[model samples]
Target chain A: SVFAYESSVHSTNVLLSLNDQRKKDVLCDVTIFVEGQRFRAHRSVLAACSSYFHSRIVGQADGELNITLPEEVTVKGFEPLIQFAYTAKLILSKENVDEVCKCVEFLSVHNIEESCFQFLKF
Target chain B: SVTWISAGLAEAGHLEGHCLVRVVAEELENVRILPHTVLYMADSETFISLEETSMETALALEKLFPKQCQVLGIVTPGIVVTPMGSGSNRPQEIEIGESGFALLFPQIEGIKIQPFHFIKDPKNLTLERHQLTEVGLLDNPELRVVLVFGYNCCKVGASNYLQQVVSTFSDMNIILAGGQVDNLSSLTSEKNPLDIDASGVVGLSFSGHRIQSATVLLNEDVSDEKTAEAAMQRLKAANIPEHNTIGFMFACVGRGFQYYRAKGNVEADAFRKFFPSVPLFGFFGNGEIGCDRIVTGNFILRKCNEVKDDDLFHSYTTIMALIHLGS
Candidate 1:
């Protein structure tokens, strides 16, 4: 049996499992509410992808975790961003594309701006 | 009019830009031309972010001073210490004006500054020597003093580990000068590149030629009768008030105006009693660190068998560092 020298198989599998677990609400440490829509997710995933979440989560007490976003963030925007952070897959359509870009700017999430640009160009 | 230290209180229109510059210029007069190191402890409302405030002050200081001097500061609990006042006073006297401030410039020559960020062991809260040495706070023979500014939560055994590490430095005159802050985000130091992330134990270590210092811990729990006696005894034993003496005091927030009820800064009053001309600059923080093992004079005459229960960190304590220009 031979193994490939460099492969995305392992990390991809890990992330896929994590995304599945997040969907099932398994070991998700934080619950984020945006416009009254509660989205449960892992704090580590959120912090890894966004500096805004990192600042709020790092060094804070590991008590009950509930972060209520301002009215600017809607479920249509944040839900896809959370999915992208955990699954490395972003869903962008004309209806929700503008709102997602605003959420991306607000959270300082990476790489998705290009996805928005590509969607807009084509 | 101290040579090494120049300080003043700035409020109202003097809180920012040219007004603050004029206040510093008048305070410095001609002491040492321009101060090499400046510290600003201001009210939180004045500038909001401690890092931003220090940067803004540094920009102002750089406009007047030649070199980029060391600028470090913190946000105090509205009360601060100044050389000209009665030891303790409010930074903001008027409610309508901007933030009140206490600005200090200690012109020590060739001071080496290093800031540290530490995380306690999850199983045990002790700070490892590796973390300290990595930041150059340990294993250095020339390091004489350390001024630690930590989050209020760091007192949970992290400080005790630091005390134990410093105690091992055989014949060295290691002084641990530190205090705890409620908001670690409100602590900042410039030109010295160190990560001061949230809830981290951040501090500066001073090591240089011809640098000597003494420290004391004054706790209020011991009767008010003995507090003065204790402060005096330690100061006397350490041979303070020598030539070119400048001081830094980190007192408990609880001990300031609240402890005295009608009057505040009782510990500062004791300092002024002994060294009237010396400049003292400090702030009221949550806890204090005063660990000194100077191998000389009366400090060496301490009873060898006496139970050394003072674990270097204290609550409701006033920790003072008296530094001079000679060994």
Candidate 2:
């Protein structure tokens, strides 16, 4: 029907849009710090998007999953990494390409690299 | 690059080590000297079953970046999953336990021979500097089980000495698990045997790396399920690296194949529950090497008075060495 007011798809899309806006406004429940910066976002969204996060935050007493990365790794990748989890789409530029790969590798985001490459292609 | 792993064991024994041996044979193409690899063999003396001892050196371990990766420090004689005694072998497809980047040993033949003298001033791990100011043997006389980790095929002492220690110490309810070592080999000789052999107590020690030796121990209130439970608890206590990957399980043949009876992989199964999907390998033997993790404050590690370090061995017990790995 042209007047399709569907509840299932309508509510999910609205909820996703609201959460996607949560990234824009920093309305997150957890805040993990790295390089003196904060990566605040919804806990369930991160876990739902990646198995690594799912295992990492299975039992969080304070709604936090804190970890220290090697000097070789940094927060540079996580901002966009978490953003991609929320939106299911990301912009990979020269500025974030390396960190994106690094973040995806550690965070266990599936097929993200190829997807990003595909998005980059004409 | 170069990788030699074991056929994952269904029942604990030389099978864990056996699979490791086959990995060396199958992958390296040479099959002789585990190329680009360092062997951590635990030596047992002559008169033991050569077939059994050779088979027990469970064949598997890890991978660090070829250029930059290395073990930074010597871990204390905690619960070690090494090959130094009798065990079993099987296909790696058993699909049990976790598989981390391994720092494994070469499965050499004839390790059951005179390993007492061959190993010399090897990169010994029998000693370490720790956060504990007051150190000693896991100084509990009422000890339940003890696993000694040292060099095999060398004089630094692996098995026979454990018997002597058991005889002298306040040994009530104490069972001497065979010791854990890196390799039992032709390289070790009477002139240069490693006593207190902590040989290849696994992990590749590299240059310029902050190698720290993390030690976990056994529990005195030990029983059947409690004994197995202690292994999982030991892993929890230790600061194992992130994304826990590979692991090995070494148990005494009597305690293992015999203990499990019809319930397969019973000993090693508990560990897999904790770290799912990591390849766990090992075998059964006469003894096992590990330390007791004490809960009661009355129990403590010794002051290193006589042996200089505490690495107790057990007989009828198990050791689950969970490793951490990944890019």
lDDT of 2 by residue, B95-170 (tens): 2232111233332231110111212234444333230112222343323333333334234354444434334432
Off by over 4 Å in 1: A1-122, B1-10, B14-22, B25-31, B49-67, B84-135, B152-173, B184-197, B221-230, B291-310
Residue B30, candidate 2: Cα error in Å is: 11
Clashing pairs in 1: none
- How would you encode candidate 1's per-residue C-alpha lDDT over A11-80 as one tens digit per residue? 8899999898888888888988888867888888878789799888888888857988899888888877
**Of the native A-B interface contacts, what share survives in model 2?**
0.00
Of the candidates shown, which would achieve the greatest lDDT relative to the real structure?
1
Candidate 1 per-residue C-alpha lDDT over B1-327 given as tens digits, one digit per residue, 9 for 90 to 100: 233232334434533453344555565565444545544554445443444354454355445543555555455554444534443332222212233233434554565555555544446545545765776666785677677666536555554544554454323455677676644332333433433333445566667765667665566544453466555555655555465656787777566545655554466556656665555666666677764343222222111223564656677877777766443
Can you give the TM-score per candidate against the true fold?
Answer: 0.52, 0.35
lDDT of 2 by residue, A81-118 (tens): 76666655464556676666766666676644332232
Docking class of 2: incorrect
